[PDB]
Amino acid sequence: SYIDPTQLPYDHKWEFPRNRLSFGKTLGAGAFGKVVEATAQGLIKSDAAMTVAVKMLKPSAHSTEREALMSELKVLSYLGNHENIVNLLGACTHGGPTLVITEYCCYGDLLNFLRRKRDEFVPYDFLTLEHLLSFSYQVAKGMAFLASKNCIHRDLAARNILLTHGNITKICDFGLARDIKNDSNYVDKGNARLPVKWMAPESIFNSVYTFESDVWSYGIFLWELFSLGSSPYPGMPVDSKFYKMIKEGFRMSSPEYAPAEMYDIMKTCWDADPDKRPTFKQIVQDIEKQISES
């Protein structure tokens, strides 16, 4: 962490009346929080209703989760509106519990979209390599933006990327709105339940989260993307042998649909030395080159 989100301001330009929100289906839910679909009235100038996604806490939440949701709101408010990030539309801080209102992404999380389109994929409404290459570029653009705003995501994965109109991918963070206890992609590591297969060695062994640890996770995201939604390190459990192999330089082979030039990006993201890993800006530039050559 580079910034203290508790020292960030909350612009009351974001404040929305909670009486104007009609709650619908649950998009995602965890132990202490949820993401719910809602209709927001008078959010538009013409007073036309619109579909939004509302993140909020469950009555099960404690003061830690209440602080975490307020810091999340202050970070989302601070970041501003970028095309490859979920865009904050408003919030309800008075009259009750905190409600973080964002745009609704038509097609949900990228992981489930990739698994759904797996059997309807062609390299050259069919999913293609052109789409995958555009998703990899958009995620590095969004991540390059967060790094410039001194934000470390800490949980970069296909599950925390959303797909909307015109094949636009948006970085999100379900966080407390994800059931990490029942998600096999989160392992028990001490007092925590962490996404070990997406984590840099320095994050696992020293709990260090940098710009470079987020780049490692991006390399895992790329493997997921070009494997069409497969789980990393297939058939390998998170045990004593797994940590040993990662420290010994073992890295996954290319996913089945990854261009050789994308696997090169993956290999550099997974360098044991964080200083030898590319920046998200270098990655954007690298993918730009690859896209232009197509």
Ligand SMILES: CCC(=O)NCc1cc(C)cc(NC(=O)Cc2ncc(Oc3ccnc4cc(OC)ccc34)cc2OC)c1
């Ligand atoms: C955690 C603490 C912190 O400081 N974090 C920094 C940080 C950084 C960034 C880039 C984003 C965030 N936060 C969010 O992105 C919150 C959030 N995440 C997913 C959400 O899920 C959905 C949003 C929109 N549409 C959907 C559609 C769907 O199925 C159709 C299904 C789900 C959806 C909704 C939602 O807010 C309401 C937070």
